[PDB]
Design a protein around this ligand. Sequence first.
Ligand SMILES: *C(=O)/C=C/c1ccc(O)cc1
Length: 125
Amino acid sequence: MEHVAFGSEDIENTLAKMDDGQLDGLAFGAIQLDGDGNILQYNAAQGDITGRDPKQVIGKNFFKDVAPCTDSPEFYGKFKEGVASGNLNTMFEYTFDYQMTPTKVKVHMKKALSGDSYWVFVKRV
Ligand SMILES: *C(=O)/C=C/c1ccc(O)cc1
């Protein structure tokens, strides 16, 4: 188990050292997106929450293909403003309900340290 707490102030520095195997040891769901919303990384805890198979969703677009319930001003709209501005750090509750039992989660979106990548972190509430 990797010990990093959800919501930690310097989480992007800590997660910069992990490969996909290490990300699978986190206590919470983690998705890495490019600035178009394509999925680059998707960990085991996220798949436990959503039912998706991690290897199968890498390369898909999160907003168009995987998670249409997030294509809303309340989720996608926040992401796209962050990508446009080059800064993003926001936490909110949301319900995931596409092809699954409706599940309430806490979401933390934060710009990654390097380049044009963005984290989505998720835990149950
Ligand atoms: C709504 O369509 C949410 C879907 C969803 C959220 C997060 C995931 O990792 C996968 C699907």
